[PDB]
Amino acid sequence: KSIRIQRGPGRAFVTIG
C-alpha cells in the first residue's frame, strides 16, 4: 500500500499499490 496524494492549488491526487 503506497498512496501519492498532493494538496494545494493545481494539485492532483494519486494512489498506488
- Exp. method: NMR
Could you give the CA distance from residue 1 to residue 4 in angstroms, rounded to a whole number? 10
Q: How many residues does the chain have?
A: 17
Residue 14, classed as helix, strand or coil, is: strand
Cell numbers for 12 = 492532483
Query: Furthest-apart CA pair in the chain: how many Å?
Result: 26
Could you give the CA distance from residue 12 to residue 15 in angstroms, rounded to a whole number? 11
Could you give the CA distance from residue 17 to residue 11 in angstroms, rounded to a whole number? 20
- DSSP assignment of 1-17 equals -EEEE--STT--EEEE-
Say which residue the cell 494512489 belongs to. 15
